[PDB]
Structure formats: structure tokens, C-alpha cells
């Protein structure tokens, strides 16, 4: 019966990483010409 909550803990520690990985928005760059 311990398997389910240990599972929830490890998958949630993963899932927090994934949601942070999607929340990022990398701002675009503007490069001028010569």
C-alpha cells in the first residue's frame, strides 16, 4: 500500500519540473543590420 504514495511523490517531483519547463518563455532578440 506504500507503493501508491511513493509513486505519487516521485511522479510529482518530476511533474513540478515539467510544468516549470513549460512556464518559461524565452524573449526574442532583435539584431540590427550594418
Amino acid at each position: 500500500q506504500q507503493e501508491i504514495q511513493q509513486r505519487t511523490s516521485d511522479m510529482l517531483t518530476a511533474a513540478t519540473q515539467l510544468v516549470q519547463d513549460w512556464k518559461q518563455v524565452e524573449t526574442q532578440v532583435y539584431t540590427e543590420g550594418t
Binding site: D21, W22, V25, E26, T27, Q28, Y30, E32
Partner: protein
């Protein structure tokens, strides 16, 4: 002398625990899990390049721009004759959900949605008009306004 042989097999067993076939299995599962995290839910918006006419008469609804998170949208401004209209200035309501880049002389404002669906609006004061142009920026639509050709009601300094 057979103890050397046992130790050798235990050696390939521990030093390289992942025999080449498990190496490619695990490469593959990493590859698939990454496809999945990189997989966009549902309907990726259709990249469409549109053109619209801007009516500045009272009662007209401001033009819309469909966006998408992390993608560039190029707003180009043209007068009634289709000639460029360089931008005087702009005020961006809600700059925390949209990021705006613009070289200070040209007639192109470029917008990215820093947030999925939080929409807002944008005032763009142009060279020749006393009246700027208001535009509503809605992200998270089923298409991206990859470029838009704004055909303003007036005539610019280019004819």
C-alpha cells in the same frame, strides 16, 4: 585461473552496467518522453499571413491580432495606397503578457505572447495621424497572425 573469467564477466556487468542494447533503449525512451513534453496539446495554430483595412471612424471595432505563446507576429502599417507608414510611437497595455520589439524608425512592430491566452490591447501613434490606432491582441487562437498588413484609413507621408 577461472576466477579471472568470473571477475571479468562481473566487470562488464558493473563497469558498463548498460550493455549497448539498453543504451539504445534508454536513448529511445528519453527521446520519446522529450517528444511528449515538446508535444503541443491539441491544435497548433495555423500560420496565416493576413491583410486587413483599419477603419478609424467612431463605432468601428478595433482590429484583432491572433497570437500564440513564444511566436513572433509582425505588424506592418500601410496607408490607403499601400505605402509604408513609419511609426511615431506606441503604448502597450499589459506588457507583462506581450513583448514588443521595434527598431525606432521602421513601420513594423513585432509582438510575442509571453502568456498563453491573456489578451490585451495596443495603442500605436503613427506619423501622419492625430488619431492613433488601437488593436486588440488575443493569444491562444486556432491560428497565428504570422504577419498582418494594416491598411489604415488615411494617407501616409509615402504616396
Amino acid at each position: 585461473e577461472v576466477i579471472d573469467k568470473k571477475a571479468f564477466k562481473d566487470m562488464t556487468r558493473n563497469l558498463y552496467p548498460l550493455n549497448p542494447e539498453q543504451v539504445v533503449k534508454l536513448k529511445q525512451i528519453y527521446e520519446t518522453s522529450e517528444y511528449a513534453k515538446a508535444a503541443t496539446p491539441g491544435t497548433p495554430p495555423k500560420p496565416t499571413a493576413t491583410s486587413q483595412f483599419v477603419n478609424l471612424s467612431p463605432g468601428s471595432t478595433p482590429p484583432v491580432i491572433r497570437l500564440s505563446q513564444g511566436f513572433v507576429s509582425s505588424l506592418v502599417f500601410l496607408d490607403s495606397t499601400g505605402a509604408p507608414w513609419p511609426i511615431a510611437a506606441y503604448d502597450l497595455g499589459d506588457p507583462s503578457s506581450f513583448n514588443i520589439q521595434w527598431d525606432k524608425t521602421s513601420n513594423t512592430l513585432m509582438i510575442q505572447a509571453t502568456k498563453l491566452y491573456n489578451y490585451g490591447n495596443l495603442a500605436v501613434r503613427l506619423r501622419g495621424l492625430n488619431t492613433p490606432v488601437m488593436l486588440t491582441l488575443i493569444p491562444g487562437q486556432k491560428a497565428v497572425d504570422y504577419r498582418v498588413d494594416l491598411r489604415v484609413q488615411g494617407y501616409g507621408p509615402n504616396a
